[PDB]
Design a protein around this ligand. Structure first.
Ligand code: B12
Ligand code: B12
Ligand code: 5AD
Ligand code: 5AD
Ligand code: PLP
Ligand code: PLP
Lengths: 726, 109, 726, 109
């Protein structure tokens, strides 16, 4: 890639049959102890990127772009992976090193792999082709920013083993896998689920993938999420110990932990003890913090503020991975700019808190401690009852999970799954004593000794290597649907690869956001805003946020809509500045002295003082020596002072403009300067409310300054003119 | 309620409480891991065949026929293997044939 | 006020000569110990408002609107105080109880009170009439929300005593006053400034006003704000002890303290020891925390995140007043909606942090403690040098202040003022032995004894009371300018008080905000964006934010622009609701059983499961018992199963649409349901990708469901139809 | 350099350091408070007049004339009060008259 050139998706899509992953496995960020960037030293930073976009306010500190410790996630999955690849490059420059691709709605129900590139709904259809394309693109992107990026998706559903094999082959770095999710939230048969999971997790472990669990789902389905903590702990524990015993490394087993509440609940006070208790009980495992979605609305500001609180919870405890949620998530399907907002927010808050735990600590003894112990107890109690009920399967049939109670309280409204029901019920088959599977990473009973004692540890030897050892053996399928694919899809927008239109997720989708305040009640304000938007030529108009300023005084409305036309870039008329530092330096090296006054019979003093006083950025700020004569100063007094004081410039104010006395007085200043033989060695700037710069100059003065003039404009003129004169 | 349920825990140290938490989690999942050692499913067999060099389309065909013949307990991959050695043909040729409904009488033999 | 009627600004402006303030002095919030609101208990809350607008996400918690303990400020001063009054009511409902009115630019230089209602620039021209109007409007507003509101402005400048008298008379509750501000930042003569301040502060103390000092100005003028901490401490100290010695109550003396830095600096780490050191050194005084403006850009997200970190600094230490900055402050003059954002942010974050310090504490030994000590020592040395230099005036003359060095480092670039220079130089007069002032709240030498030894304690008795005792003695002036006043401005917009248009600050100003992403480089994107706004009929278009997503891939552009047209409310077509709660309660009262299947030859199973599975809000989440028969289910088998299970409803899915088989199957279902004579007892919903609700009903089924269908839609139909049948 | 400047502060307790900080602040501002006791300014005098019940316009006129006549040291409000007494008129009348130019000879006298 070249930084000034767009990613060539058309090119990435070529020869995908020949693509092989450059890397395998998960990567953590590398701490950079006591890192110096610009003026500052950082205690909790990781290795800087080679290429990146710094925070807007970094421009005040030399454009440094410090990176925090945790892996930072962003979720990108629009239904069109070919558009998403472009957003990935954007997100990567803003610091995301974990790209999570949510699958097309209900891929969990596909009984096997799908192939090709059909359009997705609420996510991307995961297929070998799509995976290769995105992993290949990520190979280029990660080389550009100079830090490995983790590609990540979902192994959930009835075809876990199938997907796991494909992910393992194609170099997917991490994935979600939790048998409990299949059962509780997708009603997949529980026997099928847990048997499949043994194989799935074995393949993931072979591939050194990070695993994220399914616990966040209990937050979503809780009636009051501040009551679901005991169940969360059980769910975390069951998937963790099951994964460990299958053979995964603890260091790859990640708990998906979302702080349960948001304001106006006392959310830190409710969530912090849970965060502490979890990380004490699960010492040795990884924590994947994720942000709030449950208690979220259509205001991006409110979302952002809650997210910073989420980040504070991580900082006060621990996050190995910090996932993010786009602040528009409760308002619309995520837009490019809001993935970038979320990346900026996580980076900004965490760097802001750099070294916080050197200055702050938990009061682990006290109310915090009391609640932490209680939470652990309720969780142990929950486990006790599961065994008392005769094990996991019985507990599930009895509706122990997804109950709205605060355990041990049980409201009896949980989700009960049948041991003999759900998707795939009756598809479990006993292995006979001569069962055999000639492949690597197989979990269950495997009689290879019937063919050869020696090959027991390498069943794949029986066939001279499986696809895990021999990538050559993988069968690549391109497309199966002639009409529903990425090629047909690209063809539709090839016109946009000198014409441009806005977009939010897909090339040329034309969508823009409109924000306004209307001084009326909210219902009327909504329909009125729709009408204003149509009058602005927008199509497909939808109000997506409404906030009451006050019931009668007014309402804020945000709408989205499509711009039904395009702009030819060639048609644009684009025209072809001294810094404050440059101005200051020019004056420090060569002192600059001015005399200033409001002249004539004019007693208006403020305007002149406003471009002089340091308060609102007057020329004082840059070290100009100002000799101020005051107001109602006769024009000849001003000129006489300039000569006497050896001034480099005269600055005069004329506020009163009756009968053009303002221009007349400028003319008179010029004439008096000429008459006294100094006009060629002095600068003369004149300003005032009714002063047009161009007309001022015609009076003979060097520069005119009107409404809204600032010290910077004046100092710039003085610096530049003195140079032109030399 | 809770105040009575927890009675028997009150004297455990945090260390003992954690141990008890984890020892119990292990009991609960232990039978699930056993089911996994002793059984298989269409997805497992399909994923075995994927690893053996077959497509998703071919794996599906072979596993469906294997289920039809009631031979899942033998392993769908095992069937392809035995048939390959028996007829001295390659794994993929054996596998392709099976997916198209050939050599199943031999397998049953 | 009535909650649903707009403030009547014209009626407010009536009879101002007859207005007197309802009350006097500063009010603090009322603590509400262990306050229960909804499900929660709060540790650090104050009394709830009688009327308010809760956070958007409060809807999940019964719309509770918890109020934090600190007084919360918002700054409202557009130049038109008559528009601003409407904004004060909005902000009051969002929780602001401190309204700060910045003055028109350079009012510090008015050598006396001004009168009337001229248009301001960058602030409101402060006058008796304008103050009366706003204090009158706030009386109405504070009664409405049910909590007193502090009105606040500035006593700064050469006419401090004049303004102080007017403020005391008119019930202004708080004000900025700091003699160092006048000298350092406005170049007012230092002898006059300090002499005047004795009088100004004496008048403010009489009026029981809170005072805020001017130290935040030192942040702004510092080259690097993380070096200015020793100067801030000195400035705070000099004003604080001067104020106390004059006779002001320590509990009315507020330090204006802004955390010095922002990310990407390690801002908490740099700012927290300073925050701690100040509060330790200045124990007994009040802390007015204010948010970052120095290190801020045009991004509202970035501003908001930094502001949450500022708020955390307050929570970890102490803020008696928490002032706020609008997140648009670095982008444009503040809009209605961004004052409200700022109020919501402060409230949201503080509430989120409720009880924080019961679970977290400062590590007061270690690095924090060492840095705290070092900062106090630097401040001490600074004071020592001022004394060594021969005192305050000398130190200012020698440029000790506004120097860019980290004290004791001195770079020699500070602002030197002359003892005999600046505005008002030579206006100081020695008091003679017989000087007298027959008024209350006079600070200096006052020979009353020459007339009546008994009246020394109350000089106003010489004239039977001054305006501070006898308000009818106040000379009220309405207007001096016939063309530049509020009456004239109001007349200009008579038309909008059933036509409506958007505004950002002034009635019908027509401004709106447009946000978009363009897949090109920043400069081309900016100009292209401008052209899009033109085609949308927007005038006076300005680009106000630009953010790089990636140099080549795209740019975020935000623009403001004016709509040239209005809308008549009367011409709007406005049409004239069942919750999750009701739906669920409905089903738990009367159990609802359904049979579901994908019918015909159709194997597509996902869609039907999407509206059943709890994962994405399927009807499972509402307690509906579902008997699922899988796919390729012949219709009769479905109908037969409906009867053999005594079901309340049939839900069929038809995805394959080729040859209208989906509609054909719906018809079949109806007929079979009819021909078995149960059509009037059972409910029948059918769904599919190509299903149109309308066309489905034409087949004889009860409801059709197409793309985007959710469980909520389905359960809603089921409860409402069931209700209908009986 | 800071390390050398600070040497004499090193063994002070926090309490000593804090009291010393405030002790110096108080030494610094004392001369400035003394100035406020013993002197006046045009804004202070206008503020006295405002409190005696004159408008901003009337106050400016009276103080400008006070300064003209060299009488600031007596107090502009005092001047208004003294004239009102000698002429047996209201404070308001004496002030309005002075603000228009009457009684200044008498005042001087
Ligand atoms: C407040 C004010 C006063 C104050 C002035 C206080 C003071 N110390 O300055 C008092 C209250 C003193 C005053 C008095 C009068 N004024 Co008047 N004043 C105003 C008012 C409302 C504000 C001007 C102001 O301060 N603007 C704020 C500053 C920041 O803006 P600015 O002056 O435009 O300066 C900016 C630019 O012009 C530029 N700039 C200005 N000067 C210079 C110089 C240089 C070198 C540079 C580089 C830039 C520059 O930079 C600044 C941007 O930051 C205006 C109305 C208005 N809205 O403009 C009238 C107004 C100017 N004054 C007016 C009048 C009539 C009067 C009086 C005659 C009224 C009377 N008494 O009968 C008296 C005359 C006094 C006299 N002898 O001169 C009229 C003038 C009409 C005309 N076309 O001539 C105005 C326009 C009001 C009106 N609409 O009639 N008034
Ligand atoms: C992935 C897929 C498959 C999968 C299905 C996997 C599974 N277990 O379901 C497999 C199974 C891979 C498949 C097979 C075929 N399918 Co296909 N399938 C698709 C695809 C791409 C996804 C649809 C999907 O799941 N959408 C996501 C869900 C959430 O949306 P939904 O189904 O519309 O459901 C929502 C609403 O409709 C509504 N809803 C739906 N049903 C119901 C019922 C009720 C009661 C209610 C209240 C609501 C409701 O709620 C849901 C959530 O909002 C679509 C193309 C497409 N984009 O739609 C075709 C598509 C429907 N299938 C198609 C074809 C051609 C086939 C095949 C014939 C191809 C072939 N092999 O030759 C085979 C035949 C299968 C068969 N024997 O029936 C064509 C249909 C042709 C037509 N016009 O009828 C489609 C349209 C693709 C295309 N453009 O050609 N394909
Ligand atoms: C509806 C869907 O089924 C698939 N599918 C599987 N086999 C074929 C085939 N031979 N032709 C078209 N689509 C097929 C696709 O992968 C598609 O998206
Ligand atoms: C320019 C300004 O001067 C003022 N001002 C004071 N007296 C008068 C007057 N007699 N006529 C017009 N403006 C006057 C206003 O307060 C105004 O804003
Ligand atoms: C939300 C979620 C999914 C969703 O994917 P589907 O294919 O639609 O089921 C999958 N797995 C996990 C763990 C999830 O949390
Ligand atoms: C910014 C500021 C002002 C500004 O008001 P002006 O009349 O323009 O000087 C005044 N006082 C203080 C303390 C300020 O911080």
């Amino acid at each position: 890639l070249r930084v000034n050139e767009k990613l060539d998706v058309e090119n990435i899509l070529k020869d995908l049959d020949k693509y092989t992953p450059k890397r395998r496995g998960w990567t953590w960020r590398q701490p950079a102890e006591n890192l110096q960037m610009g003026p500052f030293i950082y205690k909790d930073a990781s290795t800087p990127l080679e290429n990146s976009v710094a925070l807007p306010s970094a421009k005040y500190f030399g454009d440094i772009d410090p990176q925090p410790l945790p892996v930072i996630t962003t979720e990108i999955a629009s239904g069109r992976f070919e558009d998403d690849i472009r957003r990935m490059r954007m997100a990567a420059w803003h610091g995301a090193d974990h790209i999570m691709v949510i699958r097309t709605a209900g891929q969990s129900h596909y009984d096997g792999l799908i192939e090709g590139t059909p359009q997705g709904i609420g996510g991307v259809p995961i297929t070998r082709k799509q995976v290769r394309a995105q992993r290949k693109a990520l190979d280029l992107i990660e080389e550009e920013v100079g830090r490995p990026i983790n590609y990540h998706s979902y192994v959930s559903g009835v075809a876990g083993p199938d997907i796991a094999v494909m992910f393992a082959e194609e170099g997917v770095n991490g994935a979600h896998q939790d048998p409990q999710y299949n059962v509780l939230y997708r009603n997949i048969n529980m026997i099928r689920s847990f048997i499949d999971a043994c194989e799935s997790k074995t393949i993931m472990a072979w591939a050194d993938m990070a695993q994220i669990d399914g616990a966040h789902n209990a937050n979503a389905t809780a009636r009051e999420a501040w009551k679901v903590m005991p169940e969360l702990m059980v769910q975390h524990a069951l998937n963790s110990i099951f994964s460990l015993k299958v053979g995964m490394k603890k260091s790859n087993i990640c708990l998906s932990t979302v702080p349960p509440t948001a304001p106006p609940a006392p959310s830190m006070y409710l969530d912090l003890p849970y965060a502490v208790a979890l990380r004490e009980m699960f010492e040795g495992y990884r924590m994947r913090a994720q942000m709030n979605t449950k208690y979220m609305e259509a205001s991006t500001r409110e979302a952002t503020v809650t997210h910073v609180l989420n980040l504070l919870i991580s900082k006060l405890t621990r996050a190995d991975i910090q996932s993010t949620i786009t602040p528009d998530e409760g308002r619309n399907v995520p837009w490019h700019i809001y993935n970038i907002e979320a990346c900026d927010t996580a980076k900004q808050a965490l760097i802001g808190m750099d070294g916080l735990m050197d200055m702050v600590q938990l009061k682990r003894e006290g109310v915090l401690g009391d609640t932490v112990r209680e939470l652990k107890e309720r969780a142990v109690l929950f486990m006790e009852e599961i065994i008392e009920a005769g094990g996991y399967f019985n507990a599930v049939e009895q509706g122990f999970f997804v109950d709205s109670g605060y355990y041990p309280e049980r409201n009896g409204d949980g989700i009960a799954r049948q041991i003999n029901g759900g998707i795939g019920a009756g598809t479990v088959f006993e292995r006979d004593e001569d069962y055999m599977a000639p492949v690597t990473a197989h979990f269950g009973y495997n009689n290879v000794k019937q063919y050869d004692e020696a090959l027991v540890s390498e069943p794949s030897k029986l066939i001279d290597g499986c696809t895990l050892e021999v990538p050559e053996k993988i069968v690549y399928i391109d497309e199966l649907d002639e009409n529903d694919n990425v090629n047909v899809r690209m063809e539709e927008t090839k016109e946009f690869r000198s014409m441009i239109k806005p977009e939010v997720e897909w090339q040329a989708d034309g969508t823009v956001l409109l924000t306004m305040f209307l001084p009326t009640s909210k219902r009327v304000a909504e329909f009125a805003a729709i009408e204003f938007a149509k009058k602005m030529n927008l199509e497909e108009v939808e109000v997506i946020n409404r906030e009451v300023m006050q019931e009668a005084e007014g309402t804020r409305i945000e709408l989205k809509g499509r711009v039904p036309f395009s702009i030819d870039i060639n048609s644009l008329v684009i025209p072809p500045i001294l810094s404050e530092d440059e101005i200051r330096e020019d004056i420090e090296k060569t002192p600059l002295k001015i005399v200033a006054a409001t002249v004539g019979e004019d007693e208006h003093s403020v305007g002149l003082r406003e471009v002089i006083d340091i308060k609102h950025g007057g020329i004082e700020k840059y070290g100009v020596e100002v000799h101020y004569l005051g107001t109602s100063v006769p024009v000849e007094k001003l000129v006489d002072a300039a000569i006497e004081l050896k001034a480099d410039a005269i600055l005069a104010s004329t506020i009163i403009s009756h009968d053009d006395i303002h221009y007349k007085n400028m003319k008179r200043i010029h004439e008096l300067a000429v008459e006294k033989g100094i006009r060629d060695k002095i600068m003369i700037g004149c300003g005032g409310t009714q002063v047009t710069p161009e007309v001022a100059v015609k009076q003979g003065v060097d520069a005119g300054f009107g409404r809204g003039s600032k010290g910077i404009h004046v100092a710039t003129f003085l610096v530049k003119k003195r140079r032109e004169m030399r | 309620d809770f105040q009575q349920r927890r009675a028997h825990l009150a004297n455990l140290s945090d260390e003992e409480l954690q141990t008890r938490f984890w020892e119990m989690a292990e009991k609960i999942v232990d039978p699930l891991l056993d089911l996994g050692k002793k059984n298989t499913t269409p997805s497992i067999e399909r994923s075995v065949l994927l690893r053996m060099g077959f497509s998703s389309l071919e794996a599906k065909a072979i596993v469906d026929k294997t289920m039809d013949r009631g031979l899942m307990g033998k392993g769908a991959g095992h069937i392809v293997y035995k048939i390959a050695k028996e007829k001295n043909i390659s794994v993929r040729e054996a596998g392709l044939a099976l997916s198209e409904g050939k050599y199943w009488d031999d397998a049953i033999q």
